[PDB]
Swiss-Prot record, chain B:
Knockout mutant characteristics: Embryonically lethal. Embryos die at about 10 dpc, due to defects in heart tube development. Cardiac myotubes display enlarged rough endoplasmic reticulum and cytoplasmic vesicles that contain high levels of Ca(2+).
Consequence when changing R96A: No effect on calcium channel activity. Abolishes ryanodine binding
Function comment: Cytosolic calcium-activated calcium channel that mediates the release of Ca(2+) from the sarcoplasmic reticulum into the cytosol and thereby plays a key role in triggering cardiac muscle contraction. Aberrant channel activation can lead to cardiac arrhythmia. In cardiac myocytes, calcium release is triggered by increased Ca(2+) cytosolic levels due to activation of the L-type calcium channel CACNA1C. The calcium channel activity is modulated by formation of heterotetramers with RYR3. Required for cellular calcium ion homeostasis. Required for embryonic heart development.
Domains as described in the record: The calcium release channel activity resides in the C-terminal region while the remaining part of the protein resides in the cytoplasm.
Annotated phenotype, changing G102A: No effect on calcium channel activity. Abolishes ryanodine binding
Tissues in which the UniProt entry reports expression: Highly expressed in heart, lung, cerebellum and brain. Detected at lower levels in adrenal gland, stomach, thymus, esophagus and ovary.
Intramembrane stretches: 94-103
Membrane-traversing stretches: 4-24, 43-63, 124-144
Signal peptide: none
Subcellular locations according to the entry: Sarcoplasmic reticulum membrane
Identification of the protein by name: Ryanodine receptor 2
Effect of substituting G94A: Strongly reduced calcium channel activity. Abolishes ryanodine binding
Length: 606, 145
């Protein structure tokens, strides 16, 4: 470490003196650091935050600057672990609070699925909903995100259970890369299928060989990879959605009191389905609070007789159970039988299956599995997997969303086109039947206007697609009996059906695509030019160099707020400081005005 | 290099006529716009190729007999016999045709696949001609604007 050159000679000899004396001219740096650094870090973190607080609160203090320059090392070391939050409601002034952030929490935040959830949440909150419920949406996002990062950190019978759990965790971890592998193998199998020729038999031996065996291998490999993808999704993202649904129904029971006072409406099929889980054994399987049943019963039983409530929630009397446990805790343990019969709650499993099947992404994966099975039945069905690139890429997803964004108006315009084509059809059928002859030879004429159904189907199929209209696909009206009438007919058809209605139909989708692109660009611009927490203008921080960068990095940071919530949850309630306890009580009462939505620390003082 | 190749064959001097694009600002703007949205343009072209491939496999499986280009009663020129030929034909002809793929194939008078073939042609015209090609054109026009 003299070659390392981290200290001066005095510090080197001090470290030698404090070094473990092996009495054999040796030292064990592992045990040395384990003994010294950890208490040093845990105790000096408070010193570092004290110096940081003094520096931020006390400007233009030369002595304090000397202390900071002497303590540069500790501040630099603890800079990643130091988190800063601004709170408005504290004494009606903006106040800065400092806390500790774990490197494990930072890594879990950097996990890819957490980042994907973050970007989806930001898009949802910025594009729609405004800022009226922005704080509530942010708090819900924080709860779901900390649950997601806890799940990620989590990611002979005992041996096999451990092995299968490890396999499931591996699939959950490698869900995305295996998804890309599935896309690549789908592209390869489609490339192989491209060399197909009819002989009724669909012979693929266009080349010398080595195509059918590898095609079969790629098909079975694709099916296996798709099954593994669905397993990984089930063990990765299903817990998050079921946790969200359980939280929603539990909060409805607590605050709204849905299944207690007034039953959900019949149109609320989601509420009707959720009625099934409010009475099973493990209702809050993923929700952190397992006492929601006791809370709702203590809330409403004294008014509703406690008996209907006890029956509808199960478990009988929560108050009686709590009293019995408090008087004497159950001094026994239930042995885990190997061949235990129906240990799981069948009703809860049915509810979970219902919600995961109503989920959209799981439906897409089920469709992928079905397409793979149909591809095994007939190899040609693998072409449907080529549309996964639309999900993969954002622009293609934007086009697929735009094709349905204006669905109602598009359907109405198509209906109007059908109606006007029908009117032209009946006019032609009544007056211009003889002109619709497609027989090029003097053989039996092919009148398309003899029958109304045929005439209308012909009009819709041909006139709309034709650039010139209907007049370009029928005999010219040389006869003077209907010359001008037929010409006006054709011109009106061309004007109203070709260059107006079809133009509007095209413009609806093109404008939907443009509007979606503009919305995404506007979300990005807002994120770049305003602060999520407070909303102060970008220029005010730009008054100083990189002022907005600093404000969004350390002053108001979404990760910092999430880590502060995690810190409050992890800390013991008795150990909470004044500001921490106030914020915790506010979060419990669901008020959410501690966020400095109005002002900032700088506008408060400097 | 173009001048040297022009000495090798005088006809290579035609490539120098593109220097006006560098010379004038508006022409340079068009040449920059043709690549400003390059990533999205490539993605849209890929989506067009994918959808044309899907229509190709559908036609190959069900509507092979309609793709006859033999005007005389001589040996039929089936363009749908081979998948590679059918897909290349679709990409080359259906995209360029204003009416879609139904205007370059035999009309489905037979009742066995009348409605199926008509829906096929209408969907091809709607999704490939008046949507995807429109988006591809609009990308470059909007980049120029
Ligand atoms: N907590 C915040 N408050 C206010 N503005 C913020 C906050 N976090 C980020 N921003 C702003 O959002 C801009 C876009 O960066 P953002 O932090 O949203 O994405 P990123 O983390 O860099 O990207 P990615 O998720 O792709 O890795 C930043 O330049 C910053 O101005
Ligand atoms: C009170 N509380 C929470 O509020 C919480 C939590 N996990 C997430 N959240 C939001 N846990 C475990 C918890 O005890
Ligand atoms: Ca205390
Ligand atoms: Zn801010």
């Amino acid at each position: 470490m003299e070659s390392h050159k981290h200290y001066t000679q005095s510090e080197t000899e001090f470290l030698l003196s404090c070094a473990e004396t092996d009495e054999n001219e040796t030292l064990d740096y592992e045990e040395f650091v384990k003994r010294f650094h950890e208490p040093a870090k845990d105790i000096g973190f408070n010193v570092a935050v004290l110096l940081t607080n003094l520096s931020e609160h006390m400007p233009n203090d030369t002595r304090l600057q000397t202390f900071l320059e002497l303590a540069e090392s500790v501040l630099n070391y603890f800079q990643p672990f130091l988190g800063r939050i601004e709170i408005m409601g504290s004494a009606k002034r903006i106040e800065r609070v400092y806390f500790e952030i774990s490197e494990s929490s930072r890594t879990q935040w950097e996990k890819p699925q957490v980042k994907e959830s973050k970007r989806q949440f930001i898009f949802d909150v910025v594009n729609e909903g405004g800022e009226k419920e922005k704080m509530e949406l942010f708090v819900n996002f924080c709860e779901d995100t900390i649950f997601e990062m806890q799940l990620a950190a989590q990611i002979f019978w005992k041996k096999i259970i451990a092995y299968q759990q490890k396999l499931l965790n591996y699939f959950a971890r490698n869900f995305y890369n295996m998804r890309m592998l599935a896309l690549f193998v789908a592209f390869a199998i489609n490339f192989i299928l491209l060399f197909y020729k009819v002989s009724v038999h669909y012979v693929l031996e266009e080349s010398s060989g080595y195509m059918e065996p590898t095609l079969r291998i790629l098909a079975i490999l694709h099916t296996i990879i798709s099954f593994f993808c669905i397993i990984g999704y089930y063990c990765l993202k299903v817990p998050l959605v079921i946790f969200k649904r359980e939280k929603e129904v539990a909060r409805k029971l607590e605050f709204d009191g849905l299944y207690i006072t007034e039953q959900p409406s019949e149109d609320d099929i989601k509420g009707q389905w959720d009625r099934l889980v409010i009475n099973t054994q493990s209702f809050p399987n993923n929700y952190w609070d397992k006492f929601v049943k006791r809370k709702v019963m203590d809330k409403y039983g004294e008014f509703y007789g406690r008996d209907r409530i006890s029956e509808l929630l199960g478990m009988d009397k929560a108050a009686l159970d709590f009293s019995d446990a408090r008087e004497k805790k159950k001094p026994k343990k239930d042995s885990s039988l190997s061949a235990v019969l129906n240990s799981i709650d069948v009703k809860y499993q049915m509810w979970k299956l219902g919600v995961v099947f109503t989920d959209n992404s799981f439906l897409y994966l089920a469709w992928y599995m079905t397409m793979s099975v149909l591809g095994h039945y007939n190899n040609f069905f693998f072409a449907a997997h080529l549309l996964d690139i639309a999900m993969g890429f954002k622009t293609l997803r934007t086009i697929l969303s735009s094709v349905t964004h204006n669905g109602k108006q598009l359907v109405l315009t198509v209906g109007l086109l059908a109606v006007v084509v029908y009117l032209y059809t009946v006019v032609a059928f009544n007056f211009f039947r003889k002109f619709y002859n497609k027989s090029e030879d003097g053989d039996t004429p092919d009148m398309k206007c003899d029958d109304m159904l045929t005439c209308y189907m012909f009009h819709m199929y041909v006139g709309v697609r034709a650039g010139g209209g209907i007049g370009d696909e029928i005999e010219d009206p040389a006869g003077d009996e209907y010359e001008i009438y037929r010409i006006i007919f054709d011109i009106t058809f061309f004007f109203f059906v070709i260059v107006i209605l079809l133009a509007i139909i095209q413009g609806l989708i093109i404008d939907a695509f443009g509007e979606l692109r503009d919305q995404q660009e506007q979300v990005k611009e807002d994120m770049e030019t305003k602060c999520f927490i407070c909303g102060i203008g970008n220029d005010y921080f730009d008054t100083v160099p990189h002022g907005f960068e600093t404000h969004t990095l350390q002053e108001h940071n979404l990760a910092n707020y999430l880590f502060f919530l995690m810190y409050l949850i992890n800390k013991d309630e008795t150990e909470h400081t004044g500001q921490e306890s106030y914020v915790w009580k506010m979060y419990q009462e669901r008020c959410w005005e501690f966020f400095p939505a109005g002002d900032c620390f700088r506008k408060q003082y400097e």
